[PDB]
Amino acid sequence: ILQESVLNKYRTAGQIAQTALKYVTSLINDSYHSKTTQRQLTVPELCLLTDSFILTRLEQYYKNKVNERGIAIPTTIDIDQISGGWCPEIDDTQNLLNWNKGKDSTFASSVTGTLRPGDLVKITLGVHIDGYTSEVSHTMVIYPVDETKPILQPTGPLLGGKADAVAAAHIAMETVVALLACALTPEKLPASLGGTSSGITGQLIRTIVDTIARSYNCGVVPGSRVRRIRRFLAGQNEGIVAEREYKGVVWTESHQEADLLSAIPSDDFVVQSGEVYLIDLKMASLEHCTKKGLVTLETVDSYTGKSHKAGELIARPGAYVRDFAQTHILKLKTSRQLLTKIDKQGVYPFKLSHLSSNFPFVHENEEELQSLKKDLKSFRLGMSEISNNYLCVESPIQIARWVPWDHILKATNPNGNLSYDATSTLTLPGHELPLPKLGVSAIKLKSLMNSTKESISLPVARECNTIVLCDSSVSTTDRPELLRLTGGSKTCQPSWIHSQHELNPQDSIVQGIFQLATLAKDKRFGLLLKETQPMKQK
Amino acid sequence: AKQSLDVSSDRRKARKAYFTAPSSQRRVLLSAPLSKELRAQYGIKALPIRRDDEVLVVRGSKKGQEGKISSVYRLKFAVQVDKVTKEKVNGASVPINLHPSKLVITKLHLDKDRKALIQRKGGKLE
């Protein structure tokens, strides 16, 4: 239930998230675009600096007034085919180099930590105060800097499928934000889009997002969601921890199958006032796919000895999730002390470096970094026994993959629905049906993906914001309005792209999208969006 | 009637040789006749079956069904075609084990060694 104090806690979390996103954007621009910095920063350094900045900023807010506050989502930097879960520690850089020596260079940016021109860099971070969570995620583009222009600018706009994915994600984000804002004043919903006297539904959300994705020739990655957020329940680990109640719309391989054939989440709800909504949309480009196929996810392991595929990425996930329902008294004193530190963090995913007493840095020092690494060695020693007794689990690294439909149809599964992954460590992904109508299990689909020679990895663009549907008493302006805690025109400004694809205006859904854009621009009689501003540091 | 003293008409020996033949011998044992079109085109009658050639079923309940060879399961003296399956309600698909003597090749997978084999059997390709 929205209140002045609850809204203020959400607002402060959103402000800290916006400031952190501006910080990472400035760091990346200085390292790769401005080039004032002598040595370019790497991805683990950027993640660590972002986390330290967030902790330093959050130290001053709600101190000695709130039991639990901290980082909700660790800083994740995903490049191209990687659709989530990439937050490596600083002590795994040489590990990554040694594990990926002799592989292809398709994941060279992730392996070396150094960004390259043409990269789609997706930055995700979240902040919670008293369990009230605000999460932001922005795709940006890395460009070569033109040496001839007096001012710094890209030589040319980004072109191709990555540009299509960025455009689709940005336009879907804006349209969904406007559509969810329309729930407060339902009469302003366009007639071509849906019923004037009726509200916003998950069916309308899904058909709008699918229409935008199909227009821009992109698929929706099966991790996308437009869901409701409560205290401590923000989907911070959605594929790992089951939830009692779910109110939102999700996209899966089952939904892709149903669209082709045209506590379980269902799109049979009505958006209500006084609610907080997370919108996380991942769009994968389908430019290189000459036929109709299915978009799925591939989990990255750290074992180089499982295959001979030179186009494989070998890495260890850096974010862990504590399972508070599991208890086991450990044998190592280091492991027991680490578990005591872990239980202080709460119910959000955490990095091993977040548990260091040296972290966050008061002054950025080489000695501070070295003491952090010295802590991290014993932290890994304790984490080995913690993970062995199922007290904590890894947050997976996932690569988007494309599997054609003809290979799936020609394949034979002798088990049907009965097959499942017995070696899987987590319950929720281990027993899953990605293709319920075809009777294909997750293990069977992974086997098909590995068996096909024409299964490729699709570039992904991501946009994720948090919004509040503020009622008239809740809002300052005496009218219902949408408060965007994260994202907007100041932090998530789109990069220079040029996409040949476009929305086709001769469709009712596209006309409703254009009218939603018009009514969002209309600041007099239309809808009211209040963006949350990043704060100044000096 | 046999005339060579090096060949045996013993049923026990023949059956043991068949059921203990190694993989390379089973390749020859698993031969399929060509279609009439391919027989006229290439000038040969039968070839050992391999993975990527298209076949027509001419015997059994699956007679008339066409498809591409999916596997040559030499361990069970059978071939598997992609389109010929047994289906269940739960979504299970079990390949039908077909014998190449009951199949007809309608399109050969042609490589260098396949062309050499056809020519040394007496082919007239192109």
């Binding site: 054939l261 789109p494 694809h501 | -």
Partner: peptide, 26 residues
């Protein structure tokens, strides 16, 4: 067979522009 009918339907169903941003680094 319902699975066979589903597979047959699947086989049946499978058988200017836009510009964002500008010449600047946000």
């Amino acid at each position: 067979s319902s699975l066979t009918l589903v597979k047959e339907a699947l086989w049946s169903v499978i058988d200017q522009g836009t510009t964002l941003g500008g010449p600047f680094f946000p």
